[PDB]
Amino acid sequence: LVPRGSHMLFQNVSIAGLAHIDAPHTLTSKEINERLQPTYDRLGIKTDVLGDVAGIHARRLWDQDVQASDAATQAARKALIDANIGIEKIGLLINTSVSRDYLDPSTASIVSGNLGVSDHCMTFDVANACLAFINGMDIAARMLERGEIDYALVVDGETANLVYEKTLERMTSPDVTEEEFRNELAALTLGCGAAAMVMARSELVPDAPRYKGGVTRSATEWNKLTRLLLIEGIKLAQKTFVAAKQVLGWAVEELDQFVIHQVSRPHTAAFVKSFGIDPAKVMTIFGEHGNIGPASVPIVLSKLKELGRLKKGDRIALLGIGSGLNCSMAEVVW
Amino acid sequence: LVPRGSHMLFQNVSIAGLAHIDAPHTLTSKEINERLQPTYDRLGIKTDVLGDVAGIHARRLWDQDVQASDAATQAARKALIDANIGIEKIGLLINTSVSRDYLDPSTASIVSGNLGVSDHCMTFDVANACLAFINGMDIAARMLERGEIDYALVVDGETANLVYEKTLERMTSPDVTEEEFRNELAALTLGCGAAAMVMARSELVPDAPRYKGGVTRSATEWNKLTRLLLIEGIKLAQKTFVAAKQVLGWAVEELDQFVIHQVSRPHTAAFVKSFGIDPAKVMTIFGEHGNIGPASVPIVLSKLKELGRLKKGDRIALLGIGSGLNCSMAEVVW
Ligand SMILES: C/C=C/C/C=C/CCC(=O)[C@@H](O)CC(N)=O
Ligand SMILES: C/C=C/C/C=C/CCC(=O)[C@@H](O)CC(N)=O
Ligand SMILES: [Mn+2]
Numbered sequence: 117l118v119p120r121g122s123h124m125l126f127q128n129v130s131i132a133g134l135a136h137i138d139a140p141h142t143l144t145s146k147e148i149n150e151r152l153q154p155t156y157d158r159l160g161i162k163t164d165v166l167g168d169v170a171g172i173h174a175r176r177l178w179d180q181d182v183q184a185s186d187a188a189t190q191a192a193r194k195a196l197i198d199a200n201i202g203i204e205k206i207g208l209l210i211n212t213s214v215s216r217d218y219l220d221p222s223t224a225s226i227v228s229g230n231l232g233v234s235d236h237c238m239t240f241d242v243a244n245a246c247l248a249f250i251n252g253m254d255i256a257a258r259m260l261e262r263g264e265i266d267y268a269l270v271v272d273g274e275t276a277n278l279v280y281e282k283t284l285e286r287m288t289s290p291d292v293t294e295e296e297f298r299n300e301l302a303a304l305t306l307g308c309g310a311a312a313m314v315m316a317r318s319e320l321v322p323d324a325p326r327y328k329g330g331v332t333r334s335a336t337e338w339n340k341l342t343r344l345l346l347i348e349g350i351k352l353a354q355k356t357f358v359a360a361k362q363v364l365g366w367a368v369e370e371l372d373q374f375v376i377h378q379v380s381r382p383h384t385a386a387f388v389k390s391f392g393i394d395p396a397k398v399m400t401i402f403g404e405h406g407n408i409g410p411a412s413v414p415i416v417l418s419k420l421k422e423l424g425r426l427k428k429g430d431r432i433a434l435l436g437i438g439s440g441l442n443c444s445m446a447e448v449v450w
Numbered sequence: 451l452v453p454r455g456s457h458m459l460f461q462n463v464s465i466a467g468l469a470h471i472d473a474p475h476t477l478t479s480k481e482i483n484e485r486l487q488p489t490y491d492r493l494g495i496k497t498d499v500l501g502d503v504a505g506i507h508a509r510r511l512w513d514q515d516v517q518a519s520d521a522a523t524q525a526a527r528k529a530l531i532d533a534n535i536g537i538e539k540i541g542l543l544i545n546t547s548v549s550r551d552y553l554d555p556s557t558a559s560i561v562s563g564n565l566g567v568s569d570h571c572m573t574f575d576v577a578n579a580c581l582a583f584i585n586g587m588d589i590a591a592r593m594l595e596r597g598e599i600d601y602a603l604v605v606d607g608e609t610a611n612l613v614y615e616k617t618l619e620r621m622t623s624p625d626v627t628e629e630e631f632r633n634e635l636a637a638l639t640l641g642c643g644a645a646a647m648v649m650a651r652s653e654l655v656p657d658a659p660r661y662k663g664g665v666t667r668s669a670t671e672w673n674k675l676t677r678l679l680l681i682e683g684i685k686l687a688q689k690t691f692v693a694a695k696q697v698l699g700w701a702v703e704e705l706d707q708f709v710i711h712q713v714s715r716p717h718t719a720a721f722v723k724s725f726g727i728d729p730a731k732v733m734t735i736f737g738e739h740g741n742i743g744p745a746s747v748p749i750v751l752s753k754l755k756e757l758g759r760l761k762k763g764d765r766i767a768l769l770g771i772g773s774g775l776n777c778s779m780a781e782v783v784w
């Protein structure tokens with residue numbers, strides 16, 4: 117009758133399976149810079165924006181014309197193995213990538229068709245820049261908590277190959293302005309890869325990691341979006357951490373890991389300083405994989421798992437700031 | 451303890467407000483045909499595919515470069531007035547259109563920023579071809595039923611102006627093949643427009659229309675998709691009507707209206723015949739507005755409302771078949 121923060125938390129929702137795919141091809145920032153050198157020389161700009169402002173030494177790309185749906189499909193096959201269940205158990209499949217095969221049909225339907233989902237499986241895509249995987253986890257959690265389904269897949273395949281190709285094209289053209297070139301460099305911090313998660317009703321999966329849910333705040337006055345964006349982003353995150361205290365009971369020192377969406381080395385450094393977070397609890401892959409958009413969060417969770425970095429009882433914070441602006445923060449208990 | 455169909459229905463979810471926008475400009479199929487006449491003459495094709503196979507006399511377009519987000523915003527302002535609430539009450543805003551301003555940020559965030567949502571409002575886009583508005587209604591319903599929010603907006607603005615422009619360009623070119631021209635004609639059954647709905651917890655809105663929820667079936671083996679598509683579509687719909695009997699208790703003769711997504715005159719005629727539905731309970735706008743994608747369903751519901759066509763207690767079926775293939779069917783009680 118009297119509301120409490122903890123009442124909105126999911127009680128009966130778990131993670132049965134989790135997998136990621138690293139894209140295979142390394143492209144170093146040194147190789148990109150050689151290609152860009154004469155637009156750099158031409159513009160009278162002497163700074164290595166990628167290596168030294170962004171802090172990206174390399175990113176991963178696909179070796180071939182891999183569609184979003186292909187990479188999600190591959191990640192989804194692995195997470196099913198990880199969970200030890202067949203595709204027939206899946207009642208819901210949500211695709212959360214920014215990369216998309218077509219405006220029609222949804223990417224989710226293509227992935228589902230690849231996996232051979234049953235006729236009872238509901239499917240759709242969610243789009244919300246870099247926070248969508250956490251939005252799809254939440255969506256599936258509600259259906260699970262209610263009993264509408266027993267098992268869900270949340271998938272995300274990202275591909276940036278064509279982005280890099282169109283981008284390096286404009287940036288190495290005699291024509292190009294500084295204001296333009298500068299906008300374009302940020303496309304070069306993106307990376308490729310994929311992740312998938314099998315979520316389930318906790319009674320069907322006893323002792324699996326528990327998905328508690330989370331909180332979202334927004335600052336859509338700034339949907340227009342530079343130097344400003346870091347500041348507004350931190351201010352939104354401060355307010356989401358308050359919400360997270362009110363619902364999840366978070367204080368920073370009680371969390372065992374922060375799985376953070378990452379934009380750049382300086383953006384991450386500022387976030388971490390501003391909230392007093394110990395950097396040893398912030399696994400980072402941006403410097404060699406780049407920004408994998410909404411897949412980043414689950415990829416980093418899956419890497420933590422693979423390295424045996426997580427223990428029963430570990431409180432794990434999933435968070436990011438995304439375009440909109442939006443900020444979400446959720447908790448897993450391993 | 452023993453599951454029953456009715457257990458999955460939402461008990462506490464209502465429609466507080468509903469509005470639509472008709473796009474202003476009429477483009478007749480006769481005017482399009484004059485432009486296409488020499489590709490028709492050239493191809494040795496003597497049939498008016500638009501007027502006589504599709505059954506579309508006209509469609510509506512925007513008079514200017516209206517973005518999806520602009521049309522959703524306008525529809526959303528009207529549905530708030532209809533509901534008599536201010537934007538501060540809104541805890542969730544989902545955008546469901548196929549049309550999209552950018553791959554980033556979500557269209558939802560742009561709409562929310564336009565309306566001036568508060569910092570507590572969660573936002574994201576759902577994409578699922580023509581069924582997404584019903585998917586967004588369901589998503590919001592779950593959050594409402596649980597008490598996470600009190601009010602939600604589900605919005606959808608569609609724009610086809612650029613589709614028509616690129617399409618009529620390829621179709622009137624000496625170059626063009628029949629197989630190509632034939633693919634392209636179907637883009638010419640699309641229309642523009644928008645809709646928005648305010649959903650709320652039923653205790654906050656006593657006596658408003660009730661959203662019970664619904665069912666989905668899929669046939670994602672056919673995500674590859676002609677003449678076949680009508681048949682597979684009917685077969686999927688048959689199976690969804692079974693699910694709807696099992697959950698909602700539907701029989702065809704007990705429903706007062708069918709608000710059906712519409713693809714074409716013959717597609718609709720076949721659906722209606724195959725299920726024995728009385729055509730007088732199928733309001734249709736396709737012949738003068740064309741296919742408004744996922745906005746079609748709410749637009750037709752809103753038109754029914756406006757005409758005073760609905761009575762307290764009326765059982766209203768919302769349905770469509772969408773790419774994937776997917777089929778969903780949900781019930782409103784006015
Ligand atoms: C410290 C945070 C600053 C906010 C920056 C947000 C930029 C977001 C991006 O452009 C991508 O990484 C992901 C995204 N679009 O959500
Ligand atoms: C009788 C049904 C036949 C199935 C046809 C589906 C075509 C769907 C479309 O192409 C659009 O109208 C909407 C959509 N993509 O969902
Ligand atoms: Mn290689």
Ligand SMILES: [Mn+2]
Nearest residue numbers: 474475476513
């Ligand atoms: Mn006009």
